[PDB]
Amino acid sequence: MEIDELTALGGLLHDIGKPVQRAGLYSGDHSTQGARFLRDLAENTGRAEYELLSLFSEFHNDELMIRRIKELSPERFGLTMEDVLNALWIVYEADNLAPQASRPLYSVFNPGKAYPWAELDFEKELPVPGDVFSIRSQDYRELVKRLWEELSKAKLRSDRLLPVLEKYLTFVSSVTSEGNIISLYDHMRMTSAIALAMLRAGCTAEDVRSGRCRKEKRFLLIEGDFSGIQDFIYRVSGKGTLKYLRARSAYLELIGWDVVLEILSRLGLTRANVVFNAGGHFMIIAQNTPDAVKELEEIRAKAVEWLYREFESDLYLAIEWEPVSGREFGREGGKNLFAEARKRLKHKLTVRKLKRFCPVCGRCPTCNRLVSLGGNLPKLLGFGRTAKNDAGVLVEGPFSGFVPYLQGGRPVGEQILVKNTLNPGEIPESAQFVPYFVADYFKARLGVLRLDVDNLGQAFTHGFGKFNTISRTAAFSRMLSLFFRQHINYVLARPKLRPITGDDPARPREATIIYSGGDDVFVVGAWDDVIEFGIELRERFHEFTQGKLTVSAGIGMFPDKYPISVMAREVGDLEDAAKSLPGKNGVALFDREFTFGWDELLSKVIEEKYRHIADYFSGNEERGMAFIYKLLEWVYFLTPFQQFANRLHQWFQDPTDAKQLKTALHLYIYRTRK
Numbered sequence: 001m002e003i004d005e006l007t008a009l010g011g012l013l014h015d016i017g018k019p020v021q022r023a024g025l026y027s028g029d030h031s032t033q034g035a036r037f038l039r040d041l042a043e044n045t046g047r048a049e050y051e052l053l054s055l056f057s058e059f060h061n062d063e064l065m066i067r068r069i070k071e072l073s074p075e076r077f078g079l080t081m082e083d084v085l086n087a088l089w090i091v092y093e094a095d096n097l098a099p100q101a102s103r104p105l106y107s108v109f110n111p112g113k114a115y116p117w118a119e120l121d122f123e124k125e126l127p128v129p130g131d132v133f134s135i136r137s138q139d140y141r142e143l144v145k146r147l148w149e150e151l152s153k154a155k156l157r158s159d160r161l162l163p164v165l166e167k168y169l170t171f172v173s174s175v176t177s178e179g180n181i182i183s184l185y186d187h188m189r190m191t192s193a194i195a196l197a198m199l200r201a202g203c204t205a206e207d208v209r210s211g212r213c214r215k216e217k218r219f220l221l222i223e224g225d226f227s228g229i230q231d232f233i234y235r236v237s238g239k240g241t242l243k244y245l246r247a248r249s250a251y252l253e254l255i256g257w258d259v260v261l262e263i264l265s266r267l268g269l270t271r272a273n274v275v276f277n278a279g280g281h282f283m284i285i286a287q288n289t290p291d292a293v294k295e296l297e298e299i300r301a302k303a304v305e306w307l308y309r310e311f312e313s314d315l316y317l318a319i320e321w322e323p324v325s326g327r328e329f330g331r332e333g334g335k336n337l338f339a340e341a342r343k344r345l346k347h348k349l350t351v352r353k354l355k356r357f358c359p360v361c362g363r364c365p366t367c368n369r370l371v372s373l374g375g376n377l378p379k380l381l382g383f384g385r386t387a388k389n390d391a392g393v394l395v396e397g398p399f400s401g402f403v404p405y406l407q408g409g410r411p412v413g414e415q416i417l418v419k420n421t422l423n424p425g426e427i428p429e430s431a432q433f434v435p436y437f438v439a440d441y442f443k444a445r446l447g448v449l450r451l452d453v454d455n456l457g458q459a460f461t462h463g464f465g466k467f468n469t470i471s472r473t474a475a476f477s478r479m480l481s482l483f484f485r486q487h488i489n490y491v492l493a494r495p496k497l498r499p500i501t502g503d504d505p506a507r508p509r510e511a512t513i514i515y516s517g518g519d520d521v522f523v524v525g526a527w528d529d530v531i532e533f534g535i536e537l538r539e540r541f542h543e544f545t546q547g548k549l550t551v552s553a554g555i556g557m558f559p560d561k562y563p564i565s566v567m568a569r570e571v572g573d574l575e576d577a578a579k580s581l582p583g584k585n586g587v588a589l590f591d592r593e594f595t596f597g598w599d600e601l602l603s604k605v606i607e608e609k610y611r612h613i614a615d616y617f618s619g620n621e622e623r624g625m626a627f628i629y630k631l632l633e634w635v636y637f638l639t640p641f642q643q644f645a646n647r648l649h650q651w652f653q654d655p656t657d658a659k660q661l662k663t664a665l666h667l668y669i670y671r672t673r674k
């Protein structure tokens with residue numbers, strides 16, 4: 001076993017004893033039960049490398065440590081006694097830099113509610129924060145049962161170990177204090193990320209005991225961010241199908257993964273070093289060495305060069321890095337060092353962005369390939385990442401060709417990106433497994449929705465400063481991604497809100513997501529499903545975040561040959577109107593700019609004014625079209641049922657009741673006419 005695998009896997013598995021001990025498997029602390037576990041794993045199956053990795057749990061110089069490394073005889077794995085010792089000290093420091101066994105993981109949005117334990121990657125039914133229900137020993141026993149089975153089967157490799165730990169430890173508290181918001185998965189990968197970085201920075205056991213890795217700028221915080229996305233995605237003509245736009249959006253995800261995996265490859269890191277990769281905006285923990293810097297400088301130049309030659313200024317990737325000490329991953333309490341670091345890095349990226357300078361495409365050959373991919377997306381299981389002009393390459397990024405992995409075909413590549421599953425399954429043993437998750441929902445006018453989280457920046461930096469360490473930032477980012485890449489699927493598949501449309505058979509929405517990720521959604525479909533979807537999505541989000549974040553939205557309606565370019569800008573402007581309301585939390589309903597609170601649109605506009613008109617004009621002779629049109633144009637001169645007219649009259653005073661009413665009348669027209 002190689003020293004870099006030793007360190008990265010040791011960092012992942014150093015804390016494996018915690019569910020073991022919470023299940024009561026053996027006896028002693030988690031350090032003791034974790035080592036016994038991995039040793040049982042080694043001896044039960046035959047993979048001796050689980051023995052050597054049991055040492056990392058056994059900590060977390062002493063006679064006993066030395067004697068123990070000697071018993072293990074690391075030479076049979078091709079390591080020296082000194083090697084294992086340096087790794088054990090490195091992981092020990094990585095864990096430092098990154099009370100009652102029944103406490104669950106508390107919610108990031110309210111440290112008063114908490115998740116019951118659940119396994120990921122199965123009917124992902126919005127595990128949201130309920131009241132404090134301590135976790136049973138027997139829950140952990142079922143956890144350890146699945147853990148053992150999947151650990152038994154998985155390659156002893158970061159790309160295969162990571163997804164097993166994510167599957168089962170995402171809703172396990174890392175430290176059972178109350179109010180703890182860091183999952184055990186988040187802590188393990190952060191430990192692994194920082195330990196591998198320390199190894200690549202050359203940190204030794206001497207640097208660790210001296211405290212030099214806490215003090216000195218041994219790490220880089222790398223941050224990348226695309227700009228120009230709206231022009232890259234939505235600048236297409238009338239020709240340009242919905243399929244074509246979905247491929248366009250999926251292509252940009254590939255372009256960002258190409259850069260990320262090139263950085264990990266070139267610097268010698270693991271997917272664990274990816275703090276997050278959300279909306280074409282990523283953060284990576286790396287070593288601060290001269291070599292790594294000049295790798296980064298070359299990757300950046302290449303990616304920027306490729307982007308400009310492929311699409312000129314239509315799409316720009318800004319990459320920056322910030323040297324930081326291990327101490328700057330954390331707060332030091334009244335220091336807020338990590339927050340300071342993030343804001344220097346944000347300022348550089350800001351600066352880097354100022355330096356940025358076909359019938360469908362504008363500029364087509366890449367447009368031909370996106371149509372092809374557009375056709376294939378219902379059966380696409382993922383993408384093989386390979387040499388640019390290898391066989392099967394459909395589209396290219398700055399560094400690689402991507403081969404579509406289809407339901408029939410055979411996966412091909414050195415990295416295989418696999419869609420919406422943590423199970424590597426089909427792929428070859430040699431391949432680097434890279435799971436990615438996307439909201440891939442797919443069913444007189446059509447409806448277009450843009451929803452976007454209000455003030456997302458401020459929450460990461462201050463918000464509700466509970467996220468001012470690297471691990472809490474990873475925990476916050478991940479929860480958010482869980483909403484926008486998975487939970488939004490369920491809302492489209494199993495909706496419950498149909499005030500406009502009828503309940504009748506519970507039916508999926510007539511809609512397709514063009515993109516959902518980071519903190520933004522772009523959705524099209526039948527115009528009333530799209531309205532009901534925006535509201536129901538906002539309410540799920542409101543319950544998911546316990547009201548600590550809000551969202552604003554735009555819903556436009558459009559004829560059929562309408563250019564997508566104009567559609568996107570027009571709804572963005574409606575979203576602008578909703579953002580520019582004080583307090584943001586709102587929605588511009590239709591291509592005008594009267595704007596409503598979320599709870600007032602549903603309860604007042606929809607379920608008070610609108611169905612007042614709808615109930616009392618149902619299948620009625622004298623067409624409500626006649627009545628509403630002239631009413632859209634004194635009160636008893638204008639003269640319905642006395643009780644019908646009078647409720648209308650009291651609404652037409654001067655309040656906000658008048659303007660909601662007009663939107664409600666507008667709704668009747670669009671629903672009923674023709």
Ligand SMILES: Nc1ncnc2c1ncn2[C@@H]1O[C@H](COP(=O)(O)OP(=O)(O)OP(=O)(O)O)[C@@H](O)[C@H]1O
Nearest residue numbers: 226227228229230249252253279280515517518520
């Ligand atoms: N693959 C994708 N498809 C569609 N939209 C995406 C994709 N990736 C990111 N986005 C969205 O695009 C938006 C960003 O748009 P754009 O790049 O035009 O401006 P910006 O990123 O705010 O500018 P800057 O990067 O300078 O801050 C984000 O809301 C993000 O959610």
Ligand SMILES: Nc1ncnc2c1ncn2[C@@H]1O[C@H](COP(=O)(O)OP(=O)(O)OP(=O)(O)O)[C@@H](O)[C@H]1O
Nearest residue numbers: 276278281453454455456457458477480481518519
């Ligand atoms: N899951 C996530 N993890 C980490 N960062 C994210 C995530 N989702 C979005 N972001 C980032 O948060 C920021 C959102 O910026 P945006 O331009 O939408 O403003 P914001 O802070 O919410 O202000 P506003 O309320 O106007 O949207 C961007 O930096 C985006 O890349």
Ligand SMILES: [Mg+2]
Nearest residue numbers: 226227228229
């Ligand atoms: Mg921009």
Ligand SMILES: [Mg+2]
Nearest residue numbers: 452453454456
């Ligand atoms: Mg936002």
Ligand SMILES: [Mg+2]
Nearest residue numbers: 452453519520
């Ligand atoms: Mg946004």
